[model samples]
Target: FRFIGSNNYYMHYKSNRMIDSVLESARDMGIKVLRIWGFLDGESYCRDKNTYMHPEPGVFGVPEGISNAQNGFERLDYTIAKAKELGIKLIIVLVNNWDDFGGMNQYVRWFGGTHHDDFYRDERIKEEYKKYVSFLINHVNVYTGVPYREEPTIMAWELANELRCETDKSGNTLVEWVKEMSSYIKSLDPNHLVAVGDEGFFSNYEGFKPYGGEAEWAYNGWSGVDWKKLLSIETVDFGTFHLYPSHWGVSPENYAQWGAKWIEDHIKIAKEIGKPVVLEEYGIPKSAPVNRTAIYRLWNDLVYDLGGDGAMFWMLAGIGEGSDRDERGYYPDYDGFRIVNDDSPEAELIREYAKLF
Candidate 1:
């Protein structure tokens, strides 16, 4: 069956209030699944469990285990339980390529490594990453008393968020890591699906047109991710890709059309590999000079009619649909893409897309 969804960055954090807004908004919007970050790293351990999951590297598996990681994974336990209660499935990301939530940069910092690519090659770092993945897979959710692998509410485990290795433009370095990490995740939990969590950049630009042949930079493998190779991994149950025309040099005038072509091309690649594909992340900022509601309609039509699995916007957030948690009874729009209200065109569009399922 087809579906529609959104990405909420802080679901795994300690804030039950904001996390509730995300899940509640999701249910109200007909969002069948959600993509959320599973990792939140930090420089050192702090009292603020809301801040980071790996406050120290590999801290998710503390001496306290389920009893005291209370601030850490237990909060995520709340997320899993609450989401299940609300009838929303999840796409849980293991780590991030960017440093927003103390991602790869935090791991690099812990190992005294300056280069970001060290995460892909450093034996210690690789082992450390595996430890974390294993912990989550084996971790019995504190609330449900069911392991993550045993939880049906979780749709998949994404290895990292928008991964890239600029140092190796050929994608060999990143592909190996994707292969190993995805395989490891599969071994730990054959019951759950795994994905590369890449930005859907391709090495072969022969016939594909990502931005109507204008943004050749995206498909040239410079981002160090080959969607073709990513889908080929045996353990990769499905494929996921993100789209941001504004970030990739496409102008607002071409935002909708550019996204259409991007989604079309990914569906083609997914077909060749015999696996499902999700437009896991795609958005045009409200600040853009285009009609966002119209663009969302166009993309949702493409994903639904074109036989794709589903598509999730870059974010879902506001009062009645706020991004952050608060007793003030609202979510914030830290990012420009949030769909802040039930009456919004985007929110209505999401409900419409869910109807297609």
Candidate 2:
């Protein structure tokens, strides 16, 4: 089977309107899956102010949006409804890094001078982290008051969005959290699949090593570096990983080979766990050599060779951050980031790639 999807940044009810646009695009191009980041202002997802950071409270906290359910699910319901209407498969991601109401940030509070490493040492925080996972799985849809109907619009519930180490912390193991969340979600809704969001095991080692060693303390002595252990969780339905070599200093010139290696390494590990691997995110800058085509093809071929299910590109459409400026108007921390804009070579590739499905 083929899977071609994009990550949508819209986090409000109005975002559902964009579904018609994506559906139209997908229909014309033959795309299959659609992954929407499950963050409608982080505040909507977690009630524990002491533990989590809410990214967009002003927009999603009060009268402006739904306050009954976690803002994340509120947005999710709308997205699901739209996807179901358009016959689009949906992947609902649980949380994000900066505005994380779920995932590691809940335990490693960031706003009040809290850093990443400080969280794993706190016993109380550790227990709360486990509860956080269970809370996420139980409440995402079940508590949102939206009835689960035919076709089950939601294809999967991602455990957390882009889970990673925070400043001063490392080894914040997510195994227990993934295992618990996966089991918890499955217990409540056995038919749907679960993902660990955009995470990679050995591929993320270098970035994580700075916070702490792979064996450092996490929840109840669990090591965050134990990604393989997390991937082993039986309840986790499919293995998912994100790849963006440019973020890690890989030059655009070598992205294809690097992309191939990235998939190979992850697939090797996923096979050990006997689960299908999903490339939850991938793509390179339009400025990349061959305009990212080589990297895209390499990943496409690798996914097929590895018996992987499919891949989702990083993003679809969104208003740029400031001044309604051209994409080149802003400076990014990394090189080779891809964006969706009309008339761009990358856009054309995205249009063509959708047909593979």
Give the clashing residue pairs of candidate 2, or none. 44-71, 116-169, 117-168, 117-169, 171-224, 172-224, 173-224
What is the model-wide C-alpha lDDT for candidate 2? 0.57
Each model's TM-score? Answer: 0.92, 0.71
Q: Please write out the lDDT profile of model 2 over residues 1-357, one tens digit for every residue.
A: 557666654433333444455555554555668777554333434444211223332232233433553344455555566666667787877556444344445445532326654434455554444444344445434333555422376688886676665332334345545666577667767778887884564424432331212212221222243456667778877888887766655655566766676677677777878888889887676555554655676687788767888877776653334433355532121334534445665567667766666
As for candidate 1, its clashing pairs are 317-321, 318-321, 318-322, 322-331, 323-331
* Candidate that would win on TM-score: 1
lDDT of 1 by residue, 114-205 (tens): 99989999999999999988987888998999999999999899999999998888889988998899889888888988887888998866
How much does each candidate deviate from the true structure in C-alpha RMSD?
2.9, 7.0
lDDT measured at residue 67 in model 1 versus the true structure, 0 to 100? 50
Q: What's the residue-level lDDT of 167 in candidate 2? A: 33
